[PDB]
Design a protein around this nucleic acid. Structure first.
Ligand SMILES: [Mg+2]
Ligand SMILES: [Mg+2]
Ligand SMILES: [Mg+2]
Ligand SMILES: [Mg+2]
Ligand SMILES: [Mg+2]
Ligand SMILES: [Mg+2]
Ligand SMILES: [Mg+2]
Ligand SMILES: [Mg+2]
Ligand SMILES: [Mg+2]
Ligand SMILES: [Mg+2]
Ligand SMILES: [Mg+2]
Ligand SMILES: [Mg+2]
Ligand SMILES: [Mg+2]
Ligand SMILES: [Mg+2]
Ligand SMILES: [Mg+2]
Ligand SMILES: [Mg+2]
Ligand SMILES: [Mg+2]
Ligand SMILES: [Mg+2]
Ligand SMILES: [Mg+2]
Ligand SMILES: [Mg+2]
Ligand SMILES: [Mg+2]
Ligand SMILES: [Mg+2]
Ligand SMILES: [Mg+2]
Ligand SMILES: [Mg+2]
Ligand SMILES: [Mg+2]
Ligand SMILES: [Mg+2]
Ligand SMILES: [Mg+2]
Ligand SMILES: [Mg+2]
Ligand SMILES: [Mg+2]
Ligand SMILES: [Mg+2]
Ligand SMILES: [Mg+2]
Ligand SMILES: [Mg+2]
Ligand SMILES: [Mg+2]
Ligand SMILES: [Mg+2]
Ligand SMILES: [Zn+2]
Lengths: 105, 159, 53, 187
RNA sequence: CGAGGGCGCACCACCGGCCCGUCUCGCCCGCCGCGCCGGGGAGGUGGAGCACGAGCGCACGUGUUAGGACCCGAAAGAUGG
RNA sequence: CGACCUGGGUAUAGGGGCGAAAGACUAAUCGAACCAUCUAGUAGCUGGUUCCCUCCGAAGUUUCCCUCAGGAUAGCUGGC
RNA sequence: CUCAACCUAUUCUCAAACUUUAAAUGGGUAAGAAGCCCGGCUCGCUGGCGUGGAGCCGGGCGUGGAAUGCGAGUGCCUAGUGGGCCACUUUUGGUAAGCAGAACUGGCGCUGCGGGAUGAACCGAACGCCGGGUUAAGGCGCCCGAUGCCGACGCUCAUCA
RNA sequence: AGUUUGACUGGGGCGGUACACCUGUCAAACGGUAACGCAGGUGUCCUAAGGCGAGCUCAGGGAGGACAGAAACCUCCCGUGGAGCAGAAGGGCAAAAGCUCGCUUGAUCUUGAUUUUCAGUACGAAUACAGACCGUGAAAGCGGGGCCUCACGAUCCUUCUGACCUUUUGGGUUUUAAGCAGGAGGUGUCAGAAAAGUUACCACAGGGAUAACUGGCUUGUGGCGGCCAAGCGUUCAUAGCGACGUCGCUUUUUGAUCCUUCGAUGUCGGCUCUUCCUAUCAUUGUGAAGCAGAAUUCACCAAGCGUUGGAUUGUUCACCCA
RNA sequence: GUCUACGGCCAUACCACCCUGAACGCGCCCGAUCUCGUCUGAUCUCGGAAGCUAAGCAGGGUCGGGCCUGGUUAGUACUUGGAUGGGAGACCGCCUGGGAAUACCGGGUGCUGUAGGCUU
């Protein structure tokens, strides 16, 4: 799919439609001090081996793309997460498609 | 085994009649549906929005809610050993007024008028319907014409 | 196995509890013994208050 | 053979009290005779109530009795309850009441009597009104019990507001998955 | 005996009302702390709620469950000899 | 007449020993001895499950389950 | 001049995954008092309008508005079961099967009894302990109850009837 | 050293996925309805192929027009859709839902109700509303994704976003951490364990719910017959045969099934021995011939009597010698 | 008797060819300054009024096609329920009720609502 780098959509903070910059959300790095990570490290320390399941049975070949929208108002930099459907190839701000155009030889 | 698709087996059920495709006639949009009237859920296939499920095609219900384009219908559905009253939102293209209720209302109005008139005229009249009684005793004239003798025909091999 | 409506119960009987059961058949005897000891102590501290300081 | 079903032949109902209380059985004898030998339907209702169990004879509070006896046209009528009359400490003014009850709490009895009222047992009620004339037959709230909070549709079905059975109440006891949209679903 | 009429228990269906959470809208009020303070309203909606208590204790029955768990039954595993 | 047969004395002990090797032998037991204990181990599996009369009276189907010899669930049953 | 194609009007034969037409059996609803008809009030909804709709408050109407049968409503706790099989008819796979798989009703399982010599399911009929009477399905030479009727009309000879 | 090494399954394994879904049919004109039933499809694709408005008409054909021809473009006429609408199929659709333009981001922010599967649980998908903020159009309106039916995912953990929000334990400030609400990272065995073999050295609990041998149903296949008669038979259908077809029988073949047996019915062959069958090889008595005789062939009554000795091979079968 | 504007049902209204059309009307028609669109004032938009019913349109016609509605097909096909009916089967008959579709042969060829005109 292809989505433009900007869109005019509702901003919850302003309470109205505003322009938003659209980027692709990428998962942040693990904190190492989140409570689940702390519990996991305590559980793993010592003897006993692996104590939690390790998935290793992947079936999906795609992910749901998440668009990070940022309100372009300087007084309101409010962000949001928009999920679009699964797609193998995703492009941000690609070239628009044309109708009466010759296919390249 | 069978799929659970919402329109499985509706190939003829939601199809249009022969030479009755195209634009929906506008009297169907002009019908007035109030709360409490009885409607048959047909389910035409030209309009896909607000379409009833196939288990409600051919079922009759009572309107309980009216919106801009649809009505809410309380319609009985039988699920194994229980009948339970479902509430479904159906666009007005897929319903029409049931004429059984129209005929009954006509009969009630006739009965009330006849009772009010009969008390004034004095005598008594019959208001309940009755099942078709045994035929009365009557005479059959021959009109000087002998009844025609009927004889079974011989067998012949047609083709 | 759960059977219809009920309360999710968590009995703490997974730990060989039958070896550590404290019966109380010596409770009346203990009451008698403590009462007799109280009487003896009160006799021992003859004019001093029985309950203590 | 005949084509009938026999699974509803025996009607399930109290034909006598399950109680062995001899005073209750004596006044059951009394009201059995009254029901048989009078045409009053009050006696029949009272007898069938005497047969009933304790959960089918819920207590009647003083406040509820006063409220039902304050209704128009019930002045100088005998309030009859087949059960216990209970003091209600939420009321302050007790009017003059003529009352017939199977049991009366000691505080309720003292309040009624100091208000100038009168208390009768059911044998005294039979001697006073053998047909139940001039009575208001009251009943305590039959569904005012904790079990009726758990009765009904299961707690985990949509549009059910029935209490679940939990050993404890708190934020860790049956509040996460199936109770809020954040944890799976809510219904 | 009685056509009609009345007060209506419990319970049921429905409509209102109130309490806590959470949204939307909006104008007020309070003061030894004038605040990034406190209180209030209307309209939806979430609650195992209120709406003149029904519980507590004891006994009995049934059902489920943890325990040797209705009775008898492995191949095995562990500790110490 | 030999890598010969044999007595007694010694050494090696159980996941160990010993094996010119067959998983052989290790007190009639060996692809892990024997003894006691943990232990009445667990069993969705097999077998059994003790007096009388009266009344009512089924299911082998739905949905979910590493589910298919089992359960939960609805249905059908009885009692109050 | 001939043979093709093509067109036109006809002609033979078909369809579970074709169809103009289109049954039977079948599925829903209605057959009143919560109804019908009068007045009035409320609304922040709707709006040319005393509009529309809904709600509410009074009043009047009983020939109780098809047949037939039956007393209904409602709650709690709950065991067993969750291997099924058979028959008429419909029906899928298979050459077929006492095969495998569906639909409908009944049955066996859980069920004895009369008949089918015999037999889980077929036909009749379902059951407390008895006497009398009468039947069902089926029978009435003898086994073996009952034709030991002067039964009626025909057909048929089989050295595998 | 500890553990695991899925399920369904006309036994199991191998093979497939009938394991989560969608279309048509089965399906017996409401709905529902099975088999490792049939014909197929799915894990995507799309800033437009989403949303409005406007204007057009498609496939195909006919007749014409420089190069230009069976297909290049242009014009007229016919054209109920015989095209297209992303894909499987079905439904639907014509100043549409298709094609071309213009403007856009309703593919946005929220609370509930409902439908579908259904236990009337969830997920997914969907319908009708209500409250915001917007788009488009002159407007009526239409739009909170794709014309409809599929295109997907819990707890725990992580990550991001939001409230000058709550807590962070004697108080306060600040980091940090924990919460509340909404997205995402996934469990395809798709209501969601973290999982390789081998055992003939084997063990146990069981199973005739389930295979290998008998038996039973069946008879495709094997074997043995019949009917018709185009032909073969120097001629001549039928002495003897029998193509195309078609009707049977048999249970000495092999399949099919899984009813009995898994707290055991000893599983090949030979040897020994008895009996039975006839679909008769010989012998007795006959009939027919393309029966001159001899020999042979066909058929009938017929199972009384007989049907052998050996080489090779475990063989049953087979083949040869005699 | 008709038409125009907006329609309801959506062929008894459609399609092919022929004939007639008074009066209004509806059109064809004349032009591009403005409004507005085009390669093209052809369409669309706008300003008109010389001509014409040739066309659209209306009405009528056709042993017209279609469509609508009857008869026939036919109590046929199929079918609810029944039998210890028949038949080796395949299937068939009867009892009890219901009951079609072609071919073929007839008749018909728009009804109508609101508002406004013309028609002596
Ligand atoms: Mg849509
Ligand atoms: Mg002390
Ligand atoms: Mg019974
Ligand atoms: Mg309420
Ligand atoms: Mg219980
Ligand atoms: Mg035991
Ligand atoms: Mg272990
Ligand atoms: Mg070995
Ligand atoms: Mg043991
Ligand atoms: Mg699982
Ligand atoms: Mg078993
Ligand atoms: Mg079967
Ligand atoms: Mg059984
Ligand atoms: Mg039974
Ligand atoms: Mg029986
Ligand atoms: Mg018998
Ligand atoms: Mg027999
Ligand atoms: Mg008798
Ligand atoms: Mg006999
Ligand atoms: Mg005899
Ligand atoms: Mg014969
Ligand atoms: Mg059907
Ligand atoms: Mg159906
Ligand atoms: Mg358009
Ligand atoms: Mg909206
Ligand atoms: Mg699953
Ligand atoms: Mg078996
Ligand atoms: Mg053969
Ligand atoms: Mg010849
Ligand atoms: Mg043996
Ligand atoms: Mg033997
Ligand atoms: Mg012979
Ligand atoms: Mg014609
Ligand atoms: Mg018939
Ligand atoms: Zn903003």
């Amino acid at each position: 799919v292809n989505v433009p780098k900007t869109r005019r959509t509702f901003c919850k903070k302003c309470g109205k439609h505003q322009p938003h910059k659209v980027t692709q959300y990428k998962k942040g790095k693990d904190s190492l001090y989140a409570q689940g990570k702390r519990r996991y490290d305590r559980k793993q320390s010592g003897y006993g081996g692996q104590t939690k399941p390790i998935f290793r049975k992947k079936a999906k070949t795609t992910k749901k793309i998440v668009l990070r929208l940022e309100c372009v108002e300087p007084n309101c930099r409010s962000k949001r997460m928009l999920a679009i459907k699964r797609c193998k190839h995703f492009e941000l701000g690609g070239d628009k498609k044309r109708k009466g155009q010759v296919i390249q030889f | 085994t069978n799929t659970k698709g919402k329109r499985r087996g509706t190939r003829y059920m939601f199809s249009r009649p022969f030479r009755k495709h195209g634009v929906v006639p506008l009297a169907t949009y002009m019908r007035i549906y109030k709360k409490g009237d009885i409607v048959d859920i047909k389910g035409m296939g030209t309009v896909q929005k607000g379409m009833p499920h196939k288990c409600y095609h051919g079922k009759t219900g009572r309107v309980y809610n009216v919106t801009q384009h649809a009505v809410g219908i309380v319609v009985n559905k039988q699920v194994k050993g229980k009948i339970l009253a479902k509430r479904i939102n159906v666009r007005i293209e897929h319903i029409k007024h049931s004429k059984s209720r129209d005929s009954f209302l006509k009969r009630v109005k006739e009965n009330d008028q006849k009772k009010k008139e009969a008390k004034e005229k004095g005598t008594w009249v019959q208001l309940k319907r009755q099942p078709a009684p045994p035929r009365e005793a009557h005479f059959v004239r021959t009109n000087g014409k002998e009844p025609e003798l009927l004889e079974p025909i011989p067998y012949e091999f047609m083709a | 196995a759960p059977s219809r409506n009920g309360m999710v119960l968590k009995p703490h009987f997974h730990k060989d509890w039958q070896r550590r059961v404290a019966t109380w058949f010596n409770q009346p005897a203990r009451k008698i013994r403590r009462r007799k000891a109280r009487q003896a102590k009160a006799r021992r501290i003859a004019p001093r208050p029985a309950s203590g300081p | 053979g005949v084509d009938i079903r026999h699974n509803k032949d025996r009607k399930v109902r109290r034909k006598e009290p399950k109680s062995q209380d001899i005073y209750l059985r004596l006044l059951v004898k009394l009201y059995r005779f009254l029901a048989r030998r009078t045409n009053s339907t009050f006696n029949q209702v009272v007898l069938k109530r005497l047969f009933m169990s304790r959960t089918n004879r819920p207590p009647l509070s003083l406040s509820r009795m006063i409220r039902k006896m304050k209704l128009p046209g019930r002045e100088n009528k005998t309030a009859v309850v087949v059960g216990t009359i209970t003091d209600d400490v939420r009321v302050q003014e007790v009017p003059k009441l003529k009352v017939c009850a199977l049991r009366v709490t000691s505080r309720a009895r003292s309040r009624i009597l100091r208000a100038g009222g009168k208390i009768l047992t059911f044998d005294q009620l039979a001697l006073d009104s053998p047909k139940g004339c001039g009575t208001v037959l009251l009943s305590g709230p039959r569904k005012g019990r904790e079990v009726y909070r758990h009765f009904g549709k299961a707690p985990g079905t949509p549009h059910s507001h029935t209490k679940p059975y939990v050993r404890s109440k708190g934020r860790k006891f049956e509040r996460a998955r199936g109770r809020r949209a954040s944890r799976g679903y809510k219904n």
